[PDB]
Structures are given as C-alpha cells and as structure tokens.
Amino acid sequence: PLIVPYNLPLPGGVVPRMLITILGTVKPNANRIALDFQRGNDVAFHFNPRFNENNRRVIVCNTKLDNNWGREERQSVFPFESGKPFKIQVLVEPDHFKVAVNDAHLLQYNHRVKKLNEISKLGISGDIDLTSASYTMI
Ligand SMILES: Cc1ccc(S[C@@H]2O[C@H](CO)[C@H](O)[C@H](n3cc(-c4ccccc4F)nn3)[C@H]2O)cc1
C-alpha cells in the first residue's frame, strides 16, 4: 500500500477533462479523510469526509487562502463506510471539481482558485489504507 499522507504531484496543475482516481479502504473506526488540491500553500479544494462530527457523518469542502479557511460547503450524503473499499474520482470540469464515489455522483465544488495550472499537488490524508492514486485525461 501507499504511505499516508501521500503526495501526488499534478504536473502543470489541473485542467478540464483531467480525472484523478483514488482507491483505498477506510480503516475500522475511521474519524476523517482529506483530499487537498493545493496551489503552493493554498488549498484550492479540500474534500473532508468527517465520520463523527457531533455523531453525524458529513462531507466538508472548503478552500484555504493565505492560511485562512473560507466558507464551508457541506454534503450530508455520505457514501463512505468504515472498513470498506472505496473509489473517489475527481473530474476537473471548467467551473468545478466533480466528485463521484464508488461510481455515483456525490458533489461539485465551484473553482474558487482560478489558476488551475498552479494547482499542482494532491495530498491524500487520514484514516485509510491507500491502494492507488493516479490521473488520466478523458
Ligand atoms: C475558524 C476555524 C476553526 C476550526 C476549523 S476546523 C478545520 O476545517 C477545515 C474545513 O473548513 C479543514 O477540515 C481543517 N483540516 C482538517 C485536516 C485534516 C488533516 C489530516 C487528515 C484529515 C483532515 F481532515 N486538516 N485541516 C479543520 O481543521 C476551521 C476554521
């Protein structure tokens, strides 16, 4: 398995029609997972399944600019399950990141950071066994 936290360079940043696929298994008793699409120190797109926020499961998405988190976007549809294998697909589209989990659309996140060609790292962190992280153009 891959080491977590994992750093996947995105050379030359992201572009529409780039598909990022993350395969892994959620740990038993997981608390959190995070994907961080980064532009230098900024986080253009943080995708954060929280397994126990006030005893609820929720996905929190946000952007970090100059070390400050912005307004959260929250999705209560929660497709992850502790102990189970998952696939996260992030398809870059012209106006948003489009996220599907286990082949089912989950959410879109509008681009707040507009210099797509500078979003040149994906960090993968949290309570998973990570099997693969890759990208391709579709
Ligand atoms: C004013 C203020 C107070 C508290 C918060 S809480 C904060 O909220 C962010 C989303 O708005 C984001 O989730 C932050 N975060 C999580 C991880 C993280 C790292 C490793 C594995 C999984 C992880 F989730 N790293 N950073 C989380 O600390 C925010 C604002």
PDB file of C-alpha atoms and ligand atoms in Angstrom:
ATOM      1  CA  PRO A   1       0.000   0.000   0.000  1.00  0.00           C
ATOM      2  CA  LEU A   2       1.000   3.642  -0.380  1.00  0.00           C
ATOM      3  CA  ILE A   3       2.171   5.752   2.520  1.00  0.00           C
ATOM      4  CA  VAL A   4      -0.413   8.109   4.011  1.00  0.00           C
ATOM      5  CA  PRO A   5      -0.204  11.096   3.957  1.00  0.00           C
ATOM      6  CA  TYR A   6       0.509  10.771   0.247  1.00  0.00           C
ATOM      7  CA  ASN A   7       1.761  13.495  -2.114  1.00  0.00           C
ATOM      8  CA  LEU A   8       0.646  13.123  -5.735  1.00  0.00           C
ATOM      9  CA  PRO A   9       2.231  15.859  -7.926  1.00  0.00           C
ATOM     10  CA  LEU A  10      -0.118  17.192 -10.630  1.00  0.00           C
ATOM     11  CA  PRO A  11       2.422  18.467 -13.178  1.00  0.00           C
ATOM     12  CA  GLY A  12       1.456  21.807 -14.612  1.00  0.00           C
ATOM     13  CA  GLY A  13      -1.647  21.864 -12.407  1.00  0.00           C
ATOM     14  CA  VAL A  14      -5.095  20.659 -13.320  1.00  0.00           C
ATOM     15  CA  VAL A  15      -7.122  21.194 -16.500  1.00  0.00           C
ATOM     16  CA  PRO A  16     -10.664  20.350 -17.570  1.00  0.00           C
ATOM     17  CA  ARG A  17     -11.028  16.658 -18.543  1.00  0.00           C
ATOM     18  CA  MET A  18      -8.364  15.548 -16.046  1.00  0.00           C
ATOM     19  CA  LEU A  19      -9.644  12.630 -13.981  1.00  0.00           C
ATOM     20  CA  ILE A  20      -7.990  11.791 -10.642  1.00  0.00           C
ATOM     21  CA  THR A  21      -8.746   8.355  -9.159  1.00  0.00           C
ATOM     22  CA  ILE A  22      -8.037   7.380  -5.546  1.00  0.00           C
ATOM     23  CA  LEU A  23      -8.547   3.764  -4.481  1.00  0.00           C
ATOM     24  CA  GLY A  24      -8.334   2.622  -0.886  1.00  0.00           C
ATOM     25  CA  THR A  25     -10.096   1.098   2.093  1.00  0.00           C
ATOM     26  CA  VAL A  26     -11.424   3.072   5.026  1.00  0.00           C
ATOM     27  CA  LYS A  27      -9.946   1.959   8.334  1.00  0.00           C
ATOM     28  CA  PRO A  28     -12.166   0.473  11.018  1.00  0.00           C
ATOM     29  CA  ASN A  29     -13.365   3.205  13.335  1.00  0.00           C
ATOM     30  CA  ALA A  30     -12.184   5.942  10.950  1.00  0.00           C
ATOM     31  CA  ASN A  31     -12.583   9.537  12.036  1.00  0.00           C
ATOM     32  CA  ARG A  32     -11.587  11.551   8.944  1.00  0.00           C
ATOM     33  CA  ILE A  33     -10.236  11.538   5.384  1.00  0.00           C
ATOM     34  CA  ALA A  34      -8.911  14.521   3.463  1.00  0.00           C
ATOM     35  CA  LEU A  35      -8.054  15.285  -0.123  1.00  0.00           C
ATOM     36  CA  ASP A  36      -6.156  18.577  -0.537  1.00  0.00           C
ATOM     37  CA  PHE A  37      -5.687  20.008  -4.022  1.00  0.00           C
ATOM     38  CA  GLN A  38      -3.023  22.624  -3.339  1.00  0.00           C
ATOM     39  CA  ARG A  39      -1.711  25.749  -5.057  1.00  0.00           C
ATOM     40  CA  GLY A  40       1.534  26.270  -3.115  1.00  0.00           C
ATOM     41  CA  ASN A  41       0.465  26.824   0.492  1.00  0.00           C
ATOM     42  CA  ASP A  42      -3.127  27.452  -0.532  1.00  0.00           C
ATOM     43  CA  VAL A  43      -5.701  24.698  -0.611  1.00  0.00           C
ATOM     44  CA  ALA A  44      -7.804  25.192  -3.716  1.00  0.00           C
ATOM     45  CA  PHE A  45     -10.085  22.270  -2.868  1.00  0.00           C
ATOM     46  CA  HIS A  46     -10.213  20.450   0.466  1.00  0.00           C
ATOM     47  CA  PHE A  47     -12.567  17.428   0.426  1.00  0.00           C
ATOM     48  CA  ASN A  48     -13.051  16.144   4.013  1.00  0.00           C
ATOM     49  CA  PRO A  49     -15.294  13.210   4.986  1.00  0.00           C
ATOM     50  CA  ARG A  50     -15.864  13.506   8.740  1.00  0.00           C
ATOM     51  CA  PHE A  51     -17.140  10.253  10.247  1.00  0.00           C
ATOM     52  CA  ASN A  52     -18.091  11.698  13.640  1.00  0.00           C
ATOM     53  CA  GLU A  53     -18.890  15.388  13.743  1.00  0.00           C
ATOM     54  CA  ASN A  54     -21.416  15.638  16.620  1.00  0.00           C
ATOM     55  CA  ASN A  55     -22.245  11.952  15.965  1.00  0.00           C
ATOM     56  CA  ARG A  56     -23.105  12.647  12.310  1.00  0.00           C
ATOM     57  CA  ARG A  57     -21.255  11.807   9.128  1.00  0.00           C
ATOM     58  CA  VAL A  58     -20.753  14.733   6.773  1.00  0.00           C
ATOM     59  CA  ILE A  59     -18.516  15.804   3.915  1.00  0.00           C
ATOM     60  CA  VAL A  60     -16.942  19.255   4.431  1.00  0.00           C
ATOM     61  CA  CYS A  61     -15.398  21.070   1.455  1.00  0.00           C
ATOM     62  CA  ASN A  62     -13.501  24.346   1.600  1.00  0.00           C
ATOM     63  CA  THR A  63     -10.584  26.434   0.332  1.00  0.00           C
ATOM     64  CA  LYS A  64      -7.662  27.788   2.350  1.00  0.00           C
ATOM     65  CA  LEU A  65      -6.210  31.153   1.217  1.00  0.00           C
ATOM     66  CA  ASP A  66      -3.258  32.840   2.928  1.00  0.00           C
ATOM     67  CA  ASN A  67      -3.628  30.327   5.777  1.00  0.00           C
ATOM     68  CA  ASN A  68      -7.340  31.103   6.359  1.00  0.00           C
ATOM     69  CA  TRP A  69     -10.203  28.698   5.725  1.00  0.00           C
ATOM     70  CA  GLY A  70     -13.159  30.126   3.865  1.00  0.00           C
ATOM     71  CA  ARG A  71     -16.863  29.320   3.858  1.00  0.00           C
ATOM     72  CA  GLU A  72     -17.519  25.585   4.157  1.00  0.00           C
ATOM     73  CA  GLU A  73     -19.724  23.684   1.750  1.00  0.00           C
ATOM     74  CA  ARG A  74     -21.363  20.684   3.410  1.00  0.00           C
ATOM     75  CA  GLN A  75     -22.809  17.494   1.877  1.00  0.00           C
ATOM     76  CA  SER A  76     -24.748  15.173   4.184  1.00  0.00           C
ATOM     77  CA  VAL A  77     -24.899  12.439   1.557  1.00  0.00           C
ATOM     78  CA  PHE A  78     -22.123  10.228   2.912  1.00  0.00           C
ATOM     79  CA  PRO A  79     -21.053   7.289   0.748  1.00  0.00           C
ATOM     80  CA  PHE A  80     -18.073   6.068   2.770  1.00  0.00           C
ATOM     81  CA  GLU A  81     -18.273   3.240   5.246  1.00  0.00           C
ATOM     82  CA  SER A  82     -15.711   2.352   7.876  1.00  0.00           C
ATOM     83  CA  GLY A  83     -13.805  -0.779   6.977  1.00  0.00           C
ATOM     84  CA  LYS A  84     -14.850  -0.799   3.288  1.00  0.00           C
ATOM     85  CA  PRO A  85     -13.071  -0.278  -0.036  1.00  0.00           C
ATOM     86  CA  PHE A  86     -13.826   2.910  -1.902  1.00  0.00           C
ATOM     87  CA  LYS A  87     -13.062   4.701  -5.143  1.00  0.00           C
ATOM     88  CA  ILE A  88     -13.001   8.512  -5.264  1.00  0.00           C
ATOM     89  CA  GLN A  89     -12.986  10.047  -8.767  1.00  0.00           C
ATOM     90  CA  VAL A  90     -12.380  13.795  -9.093  1.00  0.00           C
ATOM     91  CA  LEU A  91     -13.049  15.054 -12.602  1.00  0.00           C
ATOM     92  CA  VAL A  92     -11.865  18.578 -13.270  1.00  0.00           C
ATOM     93  CA  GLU A  93     -14.511  20.478 -15.233  1.00  0.00           C
ATOM     94  CA  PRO A  94     -14.438  24.110 -16.469  1.00  0.00           C
ATOM     95  CA  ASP A  95     -16.268  25.528 -13.462  1.00  0.00           C
ATOM     96  CA  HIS A  96     -15.900  22.942 -10.715  1.00  0.00           C
ATOM     97  CA  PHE A  97     -14.327  19.820  -9.386  1.00  0.00           C
ATOM     98  CA  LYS A  98     -16.842  16.991  -9.847  1.00  0.00           C
ATOM     99  CA  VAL A  99     -16.619  14.185  -7.272  1.00  0.00           C
ATOM    100  CA  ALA A 100     -18.055  10.686  -7.640  1.00  0.00           C
ATOM    101  CA  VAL A 101     -17.593   7.948  -5.040  1.00  0.00           C
ATOM    102  CA  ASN A 102     -17.994   4.289  -5.991  1.00  0.00           C
ATOM    103  CA  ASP A 103     -19.243   5.382  -9.447  1.00  0.00           C
ATOM    104  CA  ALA A 104     -22.038   7.570  -8.015  1.00  0.00           C
ATOM    105  CA  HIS A 105     -22.012  11.344  -8.341  1.00  0.00           C
ATOM    106  CA  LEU A 106     -21.565  12.988  -4.928  1.00  0.00           C
ATOM    107  CA  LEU A 107     -20.916  16.733  -5.278  1.00  0.00           C
ATOM    108  CA  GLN A 108     -19.470  19.589  -7.286  1.00  0.00           C
ATOM    109  CA  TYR A 109     -17.169  22.280  -5.906  1.00  0.00           C
ATOM    110  CA  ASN A 110     -17.004  25.558  -7.829  1.00  0.00           C
ATOM    111  CA  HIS A 111     -13.479  26.772  -8.560  1.00  0.00           C
ATOM    112  CA  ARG A 112     -12.564  29.497  -6.053  1.00  0.00           C
ATOM    113  CA  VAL A 113      -8.891  29.302  -7.039  1.00  0.00           C
ATOM    114  CA  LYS A 114      -8.932  30.141 -10.731  1.00  0.00           C
ATOM    115  CA  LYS A 115      -5.296  29.481 -11.720  1.00  0.00           C
ATOM    116  CA  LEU A 116      -5.944  25.815 -12.441  1.00  0.00           C
ATOM    117  CA  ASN A 117      -2.448  25.426 -13.915  1.00  0.00           C
ATOM    118  CA  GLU A 118      -0.996  26.273 -10.484  1.00  0.00           C
ATOM    119  CA  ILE A 119      -2.962  23.617  -8.523  1.00  0.00           C
ATOM    120  CA  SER A 120      -0.077  21.223  -8.789  1.00  0.00           C
ATOM    121  CA  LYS A 121      -0.329  18.878  -5.805  1.00  0.00           C
ATOM    122  CA  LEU A 122      -2.909  16.448  -4.433  1.00  0.00           C
ATOM    123  CA  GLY A 123      -2.429  15.440  -0.796  1.00  0.00           C
ATOM    124  CA  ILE A 124      -4.238  12.341   0.478  1.00  0.00           C
ATOM    125  CA  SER A 125      -4.539  12.033   4.246  1.00  0.00           C
ATOM    126  CA  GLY A 126      -6.483  10.394   7.044  1.00  0.00           C
ATOM    127  CA  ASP A 127      -7.882   7.099   8.161  1.00  0.00           C
ATOM    128  CA  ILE A 128      -7.414   4.941   5.076  1.00  0.00           C
ATOM    129  CA  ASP A 129      -5.294   2.222   3.613  1.00  0.00           C
ATOM    130  CA  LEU A 130      -4.355   3.764   0.280  1.00  0.00           C
ATOM    131  CA  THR A 131      -4.071   1.411  -2.676  1.00  0.00           C
ATOM    132  CA  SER A 132      -3.586   3.756  -5.659  1.00  0.00           C
ATOM    133  CA  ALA A 133      -3.646   7.434  -6.639  1.00  0.00           C
ATOM    134  CA  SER A 134      -3.379   8.372 -10.279  1.00  0.00           C
ATOM    135  CA  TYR A 135      -4.688  10.652 -13.023  1.00  0.00           C
ATOM    136  CA  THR A 136      -5.561  10.447 -16.710  1.00  0.00           C
ATOM    137  CA  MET A 137      -7.230  12.571 -19.368  1.00  0.00           C
ATOM    138  CA  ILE A 138     -10.692  11.683 -20.618  1.00  0.00           C
TER     139      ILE A 138
HETATM  140  C1  LIG B   1     -12.084  29.062  12.344  1.00  0.00           C
HETATM  141  C2  LIG B   1     -11.944  27.652  12.200  1.00  0.00           C
HETATM  142  C3  LIG B   1     -11.854  26.745  13.285  1.00  0.00           C
HETATM  143  C4  LIG B   1     -11.772  25.349  13.109  1.00  0.00           C
HETATM  144  C5  LIG B   1     -11.841  24.808  11.835  1.00  0.00           C
HETATM  145  S1  LIG B   1     -11.676  23.036  11.585  1.00  0.00           S
HETATM  146  C6  LIG B   1     -10.892  22.840  10.068  1.00  0.00           C
HETATM  147  O1  LIG B   1     -11.869  22.895   8.990  1.00  0.00           O
HETATM  148  C7  LIG B   1     -11.341  22.835   7.607  1.00  0.00           C
HETATM  149  C8  LIG B   1     -12.566  22.851   6.656  1.00  0.00           C
HETATM  150  O2  LIG B   1     -13.178  24.169   6.773  1.00  0.00           O
HETATM  151  C9  LIG B   1     -10.478  21.568   7.411  1.00  0.00           C
HETATM  152  O3  LIG B   1     -11.255  20.499   7.520  1.00  0.00           O
HETATM  153  C10 LIG B   1      -9.347  21.511   8.616  1.00  0.00           C
HETATM  154  N1  LIG B   1      -8.470  20.465   8.435  1.00  0.00           N
HETATM  155  C11 LIG B   1      -8.704  19.103   8.504  1.00  0.00           C
HETATM  156  C12 LIG B   1      -7.495  18.445   8.227  1.00  0.00           C
HETATM  157  C13 LIG B   1      -7.148  17.042   8.174  1.00  0.00           C
HETATM  158  C14 LIG B   1      -5.841  16.547   8.281  1.00  0.00           C
HETATM  159  C15 LIG B   1      -5.484  15.211   8.232  1.00  0.00           C
HETATM  160  C16 LIG B   1      -6.458  14.274   7.996  1.00  0.00           C
HETATM  161  C17 LIG B   1      -7.745  14.715   7.872  1.00  0.00           C
HETATM  162  C18 LIG B   1      -8.046  16.076   7.940  1.00  0.00           C
HETATM  163  F1  LIG B   1      -9.316  16.374   7.768  1.00  0.00           F
HETATM  164  N2  LIG B   1      -6.601  19.497   8.014  1.00  0.00           N
HETATM  165  N3  LIG B   1      -7.158  20.613   8.124  1.00  0.00           N
HETATM  166  C19 LIG B   1     -10.089  21.546  10.019  1.00  0.00           C
HETATM  167  O4  LIG B   1      -9.091  21.680  10.985  1.00  0.00           O
HETATM  168  C20 LIG B   1     -11.921  25.726  10.760  1.00  0.00           C
HETATM  169  C21 LIG B   1     -11.999  27.091  10.948  1.00  0.00           C
END
